[PDB]
């Protein structure tokens, strides 16, 4: 019956940056979560604990930002340079994201 749980789910799309693993380094494919009343039961007769300490990532993730970059720029005087600053402040701003 346990073997049915494990095989009922089709694997998922995501591939994580790091992978929870053994001491040996073998990867870990998923998580049973039960009450403790059952866990005690299973660990006697129906299973064996083949590792004790596991390796787990620490840092969270972050995101890469490619956004819509908008401007509202105060302006004093109207000329090409003052206007080209718009084009300039764009590049300045898009230069910042990278």
């Amino acid at each position: 019956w346990l073997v049915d749980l494990t095989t009922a789910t089709q694997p998922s799309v995501a591939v994580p940056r790091l992978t929870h693993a053994d001491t040996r380094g073998r990867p870990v494919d998923g998580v049973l979560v039960t009450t403790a009343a059952i866990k005690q039961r299973l660990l006697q007769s129906f299973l064996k604990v083949e590792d004790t300490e596991a390796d787990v990532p620490v840092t969270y993730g972050e995101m890469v930002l490619n956004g819509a970059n908008l401007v509202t720029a105060l302006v004093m005087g109207k000329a090409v340079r003052s206007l080209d600053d718009v084009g300039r402040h764009l590049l300045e701003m898009q230069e910042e994201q990278l």
Partner: peptide, 15 residues
Amino acid sequence: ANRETLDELESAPQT
């Protein structure tokens, strides 16, 4: 690439 385009309208014949 986008800088190039701003470089044309900067250097282009105006009026």
